[PDB]
């Protein structure tokens, strides 16, 4: 009694919440219990799916009487793992306590024991099952079932697998609606029907953390607590959809704008936002917006991925910038996998294999699990030309069916992820000089390179070939100013003030920036040129105090001249 509480008796007095739905799942649980042998139900599931609640809901049904006569008198007791284990801290002392508890249940016929999180415990579990005097309910995670139940033949034979699947979107809101009267009575304030339905959709799309149904129940209670606690509750007797989103911000860790509904609103601002931080190449961003626009409208196959993008040109063509901004604008975690490392059998196995350890089974496919970890996260691929043709074939499979299957058996859905690729074929051909007495430009069309490097089917499945325009000199000058501004703000904290001449910015721009390497060398060029000379003075010299710095160039020698003042 003390070690294990009585759920059936508890439900008779109250506390247990009535279970709505799950009629088919509960029906099967009743069926196995009525069996002469192998009558130990196993509510396999995931955290938050309601498997524990199903046990509590089953106990309520028995007292209510919605069960066969044989099961009407049965009593479900939930074994407390913490109570028995706590206070002993010894091997075999815990078992002695379990023997006494088991004896009490064995003495009383038609007694049901519920071992929540049974995998944690799993010596005495096998004997009670083999005897068959008392049937036992066990809740274990799907991952733990394979690790423990499947490996042990005896445990698997006695326990019957009952598949507990998460309810659909419509089902999840219905569960909240069924349980909404209880909540409203508890705090005396109600939620609008639009708000509860919206909570399910907004929670899963942004938080993506515990469970589809669990997040809905947790998000509704969190919203009511904030609104009721606030003094405005007297004036505000209903919960607005935005109010939940504002409360959801606390458990989101992102601004309210991201949580705010932007299915159609993001389209207009996202186009402007890309241009706000990126100068020029409006056509390139328009191609990206057009492909994702199709998914929001919804006039497409559900399995087909959200969007397909492509990038060409030299390294550092804003692939990281546009992707980071695109991910930020869409409020999706940025996931980037580099094909540059996938050039060997061991490395190429990484997409669907577990390079960290063969013993390790949880990670499985690193690229595949990344999608599973974040359903909406964007996938950024770079230097795909390097990768072997065989690896590229698997990409074609997911693009067609919009789904993948891991070696471990996990299934990943690409219906919610946009796939973008980056290619740098142009730099290799253009830099080469023609083999002739008089040289000729070796620049070639980017589309030509995509066709030769990749198979025709890839282009056919791909919605369109997107070529990003090359960087402009005006942008490079602005980029130089940004780095100086970044360096400038860093110096202001220490108390040093740096002033750079306009001619100095142009001077660094010509030598630093390269056509083949884009803006990558300019970044490095600004660090060594400016940080190194001041660094010596900052430690010891004129810049130790005051921090007065001037930057200028000498036209006669074409070398930068640095002036240091003690100040």
Ligand X SMILES: Nc1ncnc2c1ncn2[C@@H]1O[C@H](COP(=O)(O)OP(=O)(O)O)[C@@H](O)[C@H]1O
Ligand Y SMILES: Nc1ncnc2c1ncn2[C@@H]1O[C@H](COP(=O)(O)OP(=O)(O)OP(O)(O)=S)[C@@H](O)[C@H]1O
Binding interface with ligand X (CB under 6 A): 17, 19-22, 47-54, 57, 153, 157, 167, 175, 178-179, 213-214, 217
Q: Quick one: which segment of 122-130, 277-285, 467-475, 509-517 binds a copy of itself (CB under 8 A)? A: 122-130
CA–CA dist 201, 183 (Å, integer): 20
Which of residues 237, 264, 303, 515 is near a copy of itself by CB under 8 A?
A: 264
Residue nearest to Mg ion (CB): 320
- Choose the one of ligand X, Mg ion, a copy of itself, none that binds residue 230, judging by a C-beta under 5 to 8 angstroms depending on kind: a copy of itself
Distance CA 325, CA 257 (A): 15
Tell me which residues in 297-316 interact with ligand Y (CB under 6 A): 315-316
3-state helix, strand, coil in the chain (%, to 5): 55, 15, 30
Whole-angstrom distance, CA of residue 221 vs CA of residue 176: 10
- Under the binding rule (CB under 6 A), the answer on residue 326 touching ligand Y is no
**Between 93 and 341, whose beta carbon lies closer to ligand Y?**
341
Q: Say whether residue 293 binds a copy of itself (CB under 8 A).
A: yes
Contact of 53 with 25, CB cutoff 8 Å: no
Q: In what order do the strands lie in the sheet with 40-44?
A: 4-6, 75-79, 111-115, 135-138, 40-44, 159-163
Q: How far apart are CA 43 and CA 34, in angstroms?
A: 16
Stretch that binds a copy of itself, among 79-87, 194-202, 325-333, 440-448 (CB under 8 A): 79-87
Which residues, at least 6 apart from 51, have a Cβ–Cβ distance to it below 8 Å?
A: 43, 44, 45, 139, 164
Cβ-closest position to ligand X: 50
Scan residues 318-357 and list those touching a copy of itself (CB under 8 A): 338, 340-341, 343, 345, 355-357
Is residue 456 near a copy of itself by the rule CB under 8 A? yes
- Distance of alpha carbon 108 from the chain centroid: 49
Residue 325 or 422: the one with the smaller Cβ distance to Mg ion is: 422
Among 41, 167, 305, 318, binds ligand Y (CB under 6 A): 318
Which residue from 211, 319, 376, 505 is in contact with ligand Y, where contact means CB under 6 A? 319
Residue written as tokens 């990749």?
Answer: 454
Least distance from ligand Y to the Cβ atom of residue 285, Å: 10
Q: Is 82 in the site for a copy of itself (CB under 8 A)?
A: yes
Strand arrangement, sheet containing 418-423: 307-312, 418-423, 378-382, 334-338
User: From CA 318, how far away is CA 519, in angstroms rounded?
Assistant: 9
Cα torsion 4, 5, 7, 8: sign:
positive
Which span (128-136, 184-192, 272-280, 441-449) binds ligand Y, by CB under 6 A? 272-280
Site for Mg ion in 404-423 (CB under 5 A): 422
Residues 247, 212, 151, 351, CA torsion sign? negative
Shortest distance, CB of residue 9 to a copy of itself, whole angstroms? 12
- Please give the residues from 499 up to 528 whose contact with ligand Y meets the rule CB under 6 A: 518-519, 523
Nearer to ligand Y, 439 or 532 (CB): 532
| Closest to ligand X by CB, 21 or 271 | 21
| Nearest residue to 322 via CA among 305, 336, 342 | 336
Q: Which is nearer to ligand Y, 160 or 281 (CB)?
A: 281
Count of positions on this chain that bind Mg ion (CB under 5 A):
2
Closest approach, Cβ 424 to ligand Y, in A, equals 6
User: Which of a copy of itself, ligand X, ligand Y, none is residue 490 near (CB under 5 to 8 Å by kind)?
Assistant: a copy of itself
Distance, CA of 338 to CA of 84 (rounded, Å)? 50
Angle 30-31-33 (CA atoms, 0-180°, nearest 5)?
65
What distance in Å separates the CA atoms of residue 59 and residue 73, rounded to the nearest whole number?
11
Residue 279 and residue 283: Cα distance in Å, rounded?
A: 12
Residue among 20, 189, 538, 553 that touches a copy of itself (CB under 8 A): 538
Task: Please identify, using beta-carbon distances, which residue of 39 and 325 lies nearer to ligand Y.
Answer: 325
Q: Tokens in use for 264? A: 């159609």
Residue 71 engages a copy of itself in binding (rule: CB under 8 A): yes
Nearer to a copy of itself, 184 or 503 (CB): 184
| In the complex, minimum distance from the CB of residue 371 to a copy of itself, in angstroms, rounded to a whole number | 20
Which of 52, 208, 320, 497 binds ligand Y (CB under 6 A)? It is 320
**What is d(CA 98, CA 80) in angstroms, rounded to the nearest whole number?**
10
Instruction: Work out what residue 213 binds among Mg ion, a copy of itself, ligand X, none; the CB cut-off runs from 5 to 8 Å by kind.
Output: ligand X
**Tokens (6 digits) for 207:** 């938080």
563 touching ligand Y, by CB under 6 A: no
Burial grade of 417 (CB within 10 A; 0-12, 13-18, 19 or more): buried
Beta bridge partners of 497: 548
Residues that bind Mg ion (CB under 5 A): 320, 422
Residues that bind ligand Y (CB under 6 A): 278-281, 315-321, 424, 471, 479, 518-519, 523
């Amino acid at each position: 009694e003390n070690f294990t509480t009585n759920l059936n008796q508890l439900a008779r007095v109250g506390g247990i919440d009535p279970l709505i739905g799950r009629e088919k799942e509960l029906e099967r649980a009743i069926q196995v219990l009525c069996r002469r042998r192998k009558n130990n139900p196993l509510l396999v599931g995931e955290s938050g799916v309601g498997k524990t609640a199903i046990a509590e809901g089953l106990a309520w049904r028995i007292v209510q009487g919605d069960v066969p006569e044989v099961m009407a008198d049965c009593t479900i007791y939930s074994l407390d793992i913490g109570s028995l284990l706590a206070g002993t801290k010894y091997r075999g002392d815990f078992e002695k306590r379990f023997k006494a508890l088991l004896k009490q249940l064995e003495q009383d016929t038609n007694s049901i024991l519920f071992i929540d999180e049974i995998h944690t415990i799993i010596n005495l579990i096998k004997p009670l099952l083999s005897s068959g005097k008392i049937r036992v309910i066990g809740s274990t995670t799907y991952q733990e079932f394979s690790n423990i139940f499947e490996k042990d033949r005896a445990l698997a034979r006695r326990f019957q697998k009952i598949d507990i699947t998460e309810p659909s979107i419509e089902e999840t809101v219905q569960i909240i609606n069924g349980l909404k009267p209880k909540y409203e009575a508890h705090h005396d304030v109600r939620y609008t029907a639009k708000a509860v339905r919206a909570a399910v959709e907004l929670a899963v799309k942004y938080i993506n953390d515990r469970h589809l149904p669990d997040k809905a129940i947790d998000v509704i209670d969190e919203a009511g607590a904030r609104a009721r606690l606030m003094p405005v509750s007297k004036r505000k007797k209903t919960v607005n959809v935005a109010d939940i989103e504002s409360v959801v911000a606390r458990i989101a860790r992102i601004p309210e704008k991201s949580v705010s509904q932007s299915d159609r609103d993001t389209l207009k601002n996202l186009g402007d936002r890309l241009k706000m931080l990126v100068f020029g190449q409006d056509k390139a961003i328009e191609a990206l917006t057009e492909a994702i626009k199709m998914a929001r409208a919804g006039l497409g196959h559900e399995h087909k991925p959200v969007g397909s993008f492509l990038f060409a040109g030299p390294t550092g063509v804003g692939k990281t910038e546009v992707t980071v901004q695109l991910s930020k604008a869409l409020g999706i975690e940025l996931l980037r996998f580099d094909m540059s490392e996938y050039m060997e059998r061991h490395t190429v196995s990484r997409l669907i294999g577990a390079p960290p350890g063969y013993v390790g089974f949880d990670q499985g496919g690193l690229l595949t699990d990344a999608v599973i970890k974040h359903p909406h996260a964007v996938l950024l691929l770079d230097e795909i030309e390097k990768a072997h043709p065989d690896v590229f074939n698997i990409l074609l499979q997911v693009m067609d069916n919009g789904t993948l299957t891991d070696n471990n058996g996990r299934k990943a859905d690409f219906r919610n992820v946009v796939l973008v690729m980056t290619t740098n074929a142009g730099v290799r051909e253009t830099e080469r000089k023609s083999i002739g007495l008089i040289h000729q430009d070796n620049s070639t069309d980017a589309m030509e390179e995509i066709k030769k490097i990749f198979t025709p089917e890839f282009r056919n499945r791909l919605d369109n070939i997107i070529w990003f325009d090359h960087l402009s000199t005006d942008v490079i000058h602005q980029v130089v100013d940004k780095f100086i501004v970044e360096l400038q703000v860093q110096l202001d904290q220490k108390g040093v003030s740096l002033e750079v001449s306009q001619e100095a910015r142009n001077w660094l721009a010509e030598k630093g920036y390269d056509r083949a390497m884009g803006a990558r060398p300019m970044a490095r060029v600004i660090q060594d040129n400016l940080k190194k000379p001041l660094a010596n003075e900052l430690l010891f010299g004129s810049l130790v105090d005051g921090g007065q710095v001037t930057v200028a160039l000498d036209k006669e020698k074409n070398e930068l001249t640095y002036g240091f003042q003690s100040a």
